[PDB]
């Protein structure tokens, strides 16, 4: 059997290691696999499925490039008897994917909220107050307010914790350091900040050590390299979340599997999930 892999962009690492896992696994399991790349653009995904159609694929392990504008894409595959299995990015309808897996960011950001409140609690059990600040990922991503909203969905329970600023850093060091430098000069009294990510963590933390304020606590989320280093290493930055991509690929490539070997009971929103990284 050939399942065909369409991703949405392979110009950025994280979309890559889903594309190539997803063609890895599907060899591992006996099948051949072929990875289409959408381009960012969903009249390429369209031509793509057209085509995936045409040649008579068994499954489809799909990254959509819109979560509106892809579904008719799905439909199309649907209607063709050939089922599609979302990775990392879903669709904004039912009915038509067997199944959409994605990292589970909400419960991520409860587990960053958690710590968040047991770390600082530790530190300043006696504070009447404790603020902080905030930096938000791209205010359009799905992934942004999943974070943040988990995150608050804790935090926001102890009023001592006071977020004092919260702000767009769009998912990257180098705005995330100009953003910081300036909430720093705003609001010197924060003793931590959370960030939707490790890009914007290492950014944060850089404005932090140009500003003398190495004494304030840094929490992120992915579990890059660097941000694990810097935790291990006794860095101001002392947790993350790390993410599961390649177990994510790797799933919707098995249940593909599991489908054309007759299973058809899946659910059809599915988290994989996420662990809190700490230095302890």
């Known amino acids: 059997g050939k399942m065909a892999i369409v991703i949405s962009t392979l110009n950025n690492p994280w979309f890559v290691v889903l594309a190539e896992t997803a063609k890895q696994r599907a060899e591992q ?5 072929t990875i289409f790349d959408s381009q960012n ?5 369209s031509a793509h499925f057209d085509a995936i159609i045409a040649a008579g694929y068994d499954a ?8 509106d504008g892809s579904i008719a894409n799905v439909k199309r595959a649907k209607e063709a008897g050939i089922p599609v299995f979302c990775v990392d990015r ?7 994917a067997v199944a959409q897996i994605y990292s589970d960011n909400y419960y991520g950001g409860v587990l960053a909220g958690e710590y968040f409140v047991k ?3 530790e530190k300043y059990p006696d504070a009447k107050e404790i603020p902080y600040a905030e930096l938000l990922g791209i205010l359009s991503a799905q992934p942004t307010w999943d974070r943040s909203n988990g995150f608050h969905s804790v935090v926001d329970q102890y009023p001592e914790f006071k977020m004092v600023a919260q702000q767009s850093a769009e998912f990257d060091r180098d705005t995330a350091y100009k953003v910081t430098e300036q909430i720093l000069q705003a609001h010197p009294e924060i003793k931590a900040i959370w960030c939707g990510n490790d890009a914007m963590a290492l950014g944060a933390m850089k404005a932090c050590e140009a500003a003398g304020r190495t004494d304030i606590y840094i929490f992120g989320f992915d579990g890059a390299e660097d941000v694990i280093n810097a935790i291990k290493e006794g860095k101001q930055i002392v947790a993350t979340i790390m993410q599961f991509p390649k ?8 249940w593909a599997d ?6 058809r009971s899946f659910p059809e929103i599915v988290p994989v999930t996420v662990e809190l990284v700490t230095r302890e």
């Not at 653009?41 to 995904?45: N, S």
């Not at 489809?60 to 979560?67: K, L, Q, S, V, Y």
């Open 41 to 45: 653009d969903t009249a390429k995904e």
């Open 258 to 263: 599991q489908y054309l070997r007759g299973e």
């Open 90 to 96: 879903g669709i904004n309808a039912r009915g038509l």
């Open 29 to 33: 399991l006996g099948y051949e696999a």
């Open 60 to 67: 489809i392990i799909f990254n959509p490039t819109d979560a």
């Open 119 to 121: 770390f600082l609690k």
């Open 247 to 254: 177990l994510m690929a790797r799933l919707a490539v098995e």
